[PDB]
Design a binder for this molecule. Structure first.
Ligand SMILES: Cc1ncc(COP(=O)(O)O)c(CNCCCC(=O)O)c1O
Ligand SMILES: Cc1ncc(COP(=O)(O)O)c(CNCCCC(=O)O)c1O
Lengths: 360, 360
């Protein structure tokens, strides 16, 4: 059980300030103890929404009122809710390759879903123009899984597309947006939007811990009114978790945490890439490593993706292949996550990966 | 802001062992710390499901394997999931009066929903037989909101009905089942079921705190296989909350807690009823007070339910009327919850209620 993790679905625990999180929980609990006997406001505790609002206004430039926000026990429960606010007959469009779980959720809900190939600037506007969908689902900070950072130019083009005819919506999934390495960070589509066509979605799974189960989305005014007319919804995110998060943010512990992890992840990513190129004698192609907590590696080998993956598991290496992200040759590509990866495991993990790819 | 609560949607905080809960969280966290960097198993952490299983086998006689269980960030997210496992065209049947939120969820999902009146033994089997639905939704321990305890005889009758033709399902919502006052507790429908037609649903909102957001449901083998074929679902209940709950149960703190609250709620309910009958000079009818954390009171007054409710709010009394639970004269009826009600507020609250009903 000496497993090494190259997983893209994990967070670091070694440097997570668990004692501070617990201290924040105790403080938040004793301050709002009486409210724990009742359910949360359906959109989430107001003070907590206000704290997330100020945060994402500062870091992503997002423009909204806390009343527009809905928390949030996972992006999927929010997405589920979102599809019930949007027109029932809406045609969705997802990036290809992309998030298969969300693709499956949409298809399972009976929705028509188009897939849009990527170019060097991310989600192809030419393909969007051609296929004429209603609702875009896009990951601009770090394309999931390819890692492409959508430049401002393509962001404008998508925004121009949504604004020119009505009933066009853009779901901006800002997953993995906290960490941009040696490029400046870029404002959210939502921030650049002048016509309120963007639904901004965010999560704390990467910046904190995925098991905390706190996510959020920001609704355009008209979709917010559609939400309010339901009236039966209940909040799914834990009240204690909500209150703790607010204290964590407002006390400066979150900013302290992000500052530390930003440096840590950057140094670890650099060490890992140096180790990969040294072990593979530079016979590897690394893509999508300018932001986020994973990148893509292509190998020059006759071994199939499946057999490499099969051998990796026998080597107790947790790793996934690019075919996981197909919605619909001789260079297998894998996703290399490094969030959970222990610094002390870099060389051992990279050596195991070499044996998985080549057989020795 | 001197509010008194007769709410049925609350839990006691004054006697909740918050320090023990926190001690259990710290212990659970340090024991399973490494797992917090990954997402939970989609059905919930296995050890946590096993702990809930043993608990509900002991207290409700429920018969299942942990593999059948799904957690659980609220009954509504589980119900949502359940309707996607059941036949899409299934005709549901709910108790009338009943849980309007769930009625709205089902209707919003495009489902046909019948309503079934109650008799002295609860959900009428004669009405069920007449209307011929597919899926029953029932609250046997303490009918929501009427408080009627479904006797074993009616439970058998419902079970016989589901077993006699295929594609008949019973959703057993065992909300408010922890506390039965001066009657013996009764085994769940699920426990008496010989044909695997029951979906058992439970929550910790009443026995712990509603803001913890942990609920669960137990699926019949065939519905479990239907669940497993989706494959894209993610867990919605917090991992820390899950792990804490397991430690809370397995350390004996839960049993200790339930023992204490059982006595506390029983004594408080008795004091409240004595206060009500004294203040209203016995001109009140109390119904559904043999279990659960609320009962029903009918008043002899010309004031409408709405005007009584309107005056109550001006008196800073949190209270709801029976019409809240209509899915589709001269004796207004209110629901009196007492979970959150402070012992020291009984007389002041009962005096405010008298002024709301009568005007002085
Ligand atoms: C594309 C994308 N968007 C959001 C999330 C975060 O979801 P939660 O808010 O934490 O529930 C993620 C989730 N990623 C883990 C699953 C990746 C996989 O390969 O299945 C995401 O990918
Ligand atoms: C009938 C019924 N079943 C289950 C629940 C518990 O739901 P959670 O697991 O806590 O999400 C409840 C919920 N009750 C509070 C709402 C009552 C109302 O008047 O709206 C319930 O009623």
């Amino acid at each position: 059980s000496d497993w090494i993790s190259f997983s893209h679905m994990s967070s670091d625990t070694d440097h997570f300030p668990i004692k501070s999180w617990f201290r924040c929980e105790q403080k938040a609990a004793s301050r709002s103890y009486a409210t724990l006997g009742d359910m949360s406001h359906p959109q989430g505790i107001y003070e907590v929404r206000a704290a997330i609002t100020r945060l994402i206004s500062l870091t992503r430039g997002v423009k909204c009122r806390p009343e527009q926000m809905i928390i949030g026990a996972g992006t999927q429960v929010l997405m589920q809710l979102l599809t019930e606010l949007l027109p029932k007959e809406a045609v969705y469009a997802m990036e290809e390759p992309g998030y298969r779980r969300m693709y499956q959720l949409l298809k399972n809900a009976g929705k028509q879903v188009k897939t849009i190939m990527l170019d060097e600037k991310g989600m192809s506007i030419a393909e969007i123009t051609r296929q004429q969908p209603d609702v875009l689902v896009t990951t601009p900070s770090h394309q999931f899984p390819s890692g492409t950072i959508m430049p401002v130019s393509r962001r404008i083009q998508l925004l121009n597309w949504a604004a020119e005819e009505p009933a066009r919506y853009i779901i901006e999934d800002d997953y993995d947006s906290e960490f941009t390495y040696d490029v400046e960070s870029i404002p959210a589509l939502q921030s650049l939007d002048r016509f309120q066509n963007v639904i901004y979605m965010g999560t704390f799974s990467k910046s904190l811990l995925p098991g905390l189960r706190i996510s959020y989305m920001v609704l355009p005014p008209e979709l917010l009114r559609a939400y309010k007319q339901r009236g039966y919804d209940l909040q799914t995110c834990s009240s204690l978790t909500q209150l703790t998060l607010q204290e964590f943010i407002e006390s400066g512990e979150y900013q302290k945490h992000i500052k530390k992890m930003k440096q840590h992840y950057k140094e670890k990513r650099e060490r890992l890439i140096t180790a990969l190129e040294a072990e593979f004698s530079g016979e590897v192609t690394v893509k999508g490593a300018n932001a986020g907590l994973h990148f893509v590696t292509e190998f020059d080998t006759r071994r199939t993706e499946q057999d490499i993956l099969s051998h990796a598991a026998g080597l107790q290496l947790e790793i996934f292949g690019m075919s996981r992200f197909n919605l619909k040759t001789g260079r297998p590509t894998l996703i290399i996550g490094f969030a959970r990866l222990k610094e002390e495991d870099i060389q051992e993990g990279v050596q195991r990966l070499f044996k998985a790819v080549y057989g020795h």
